[PDB]
Amino acid sequence: GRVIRNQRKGAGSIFTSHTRLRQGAAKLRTLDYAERHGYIRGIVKQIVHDSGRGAPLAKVVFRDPYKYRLREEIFIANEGVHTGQFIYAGKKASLNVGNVLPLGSVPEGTIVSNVEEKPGDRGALARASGNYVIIIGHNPDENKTRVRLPSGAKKVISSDARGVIGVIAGGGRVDKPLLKAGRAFHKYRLKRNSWPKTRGVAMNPVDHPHGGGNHQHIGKASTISRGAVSGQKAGLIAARRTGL
């Protein structure tokens, strides 16, 4: 046979992300002396749309501690944040929506978003619209914090990792039906080349493991083991169970 569709994506020729209109990478401030000891005040200058991203972005300007200039950061806006609001980031910041604090400086049950997996990686968890992280406990010994992730998993994270108080804005987006192929077209036009999708059973055997036959049918179990090689992993990979 020939190289199947899912194998061709790794070469990254026509399957790269469309990033012309992106506002920039959304990250927290670099963890510096002001953050880990006190707090620093920023101001929300504007809230803008980002192509390919459901959640809006906020531009926050801080003063440079060591130079006379202004440094602009791109944050993922939370619900309630407005233009002209003062944002406080650091260990000694207050418990308010939009503030950035270490996970060990907030009580149990606090709702946070854009949470760092490790202290200083500038946000990895709960970034999509309408998502958040719930803090469920603290372990002052070994300096660890236990949280609940949007997928439902429980993770143990360092207490020095930072997070933004609140919930990512733009929630409820997926409740609206797309209702037509045209809206799906424009959605992925700003993301990547992955739409539309041709079913494997509609192809020939040279093209896909599901191809061929005088009827359209898979012909063998679609549950594929974790140990299969590239060109075989098509269908349900390492499925623990199937059915409704």
Partner RNA sequence: GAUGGGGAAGCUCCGUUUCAAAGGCCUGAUUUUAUGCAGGCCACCAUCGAAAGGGAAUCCGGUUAAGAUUCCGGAACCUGG
Partner RNA sequence: GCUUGUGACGGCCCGUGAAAAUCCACAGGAAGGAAUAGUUUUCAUGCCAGGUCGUACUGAUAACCGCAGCAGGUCUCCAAG
Partner RNA sequence: UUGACAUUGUGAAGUACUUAUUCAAUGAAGCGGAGCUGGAAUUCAUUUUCCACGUUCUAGCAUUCAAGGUCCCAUUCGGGGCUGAUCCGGGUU
Which residues in this chain contact RNA in the complex, by CB under 7 A? 20-21, 30, 32-34, 36-41, 43, 45, 49, 51-52, 54, 63, 65-68, 83-84, 86, 88, 90, 92-94, 96, 99, 120-121, 173-178, 182-183, 186-187, 189-190, 227
Q: Is 84 in the site for other proteins (CB under 8 A)?
A: no
Shorter beta-carbon distance to other proteins: residue 84 or 182: 84
CB atoms within 10 A of CB 134: 14
Sheet with 144-148: strands ordered across: 70-76, 57-63, 39-48, 86-90, 100-102, 162-165, 111-113, 133-139, 144-148, 154-158
From residue 205 to residue 244, what is the string marking binding to Mg ion with x (rule CB under 5 A)? ----x-----------------------------------
| 65 contributes a contact to Mg ion by CB under 5 A | no
Q: Can the peptide bond before residue 196 be classed as cis, meaning omega within 30 degrees of 0?
A: yes
Q: Measured from the CB of residue 233, what is the shortest distance to RNA in angstroms? A: 15
Supply the DSSP symbol for 54: S
Q: Are strands 236-237 and 223-224 parallel, antiparallel or unpaired?
A: parallel
Q: Does 30 bind other proteins (CB under 8 A)?
A: no
Q: How far is the CB of 20 from Mg ion (least distance, A)?
A: 20
Q: Give long-range contacts, CB 8 A cutoff, 24+ apart: 187-191.
A: 189/18, 190/18, 190/21, 190/51, 190/52, 191/17, 191/18, 191/52
DSSP string, 103-136: GGGS-TT-EEESB-SSTTS---BS-STT--EEEE
Nearest to 158 by CA among 199, 126, 115: 115
89 near other proteins, rule: CB under 8 A: no
Total interface residues for Mg ion by CB under 5 A: 2
Residue 68 partner contact from Cl ion, Mg ion, other proteins, none using kind-dependent CB cut-offs of 5 to 8 Å: other proteins
For Mg ion, the closer CB: 1 or 24: 1
CB of 200 to RNA, least distance (A): 25
Does 41 participate in binding other proteins (rule CB under 8 A)? yes
Min separation Cβ 160 and RNA, Å: 10
Residue numbers of the site for other proteins (CB under 8 A)?
Answer: 33-34, 37-41, 64-68, 90
Residue numbers of the site for Mg ion (CB under 5 A)?
Answer: 1, 209
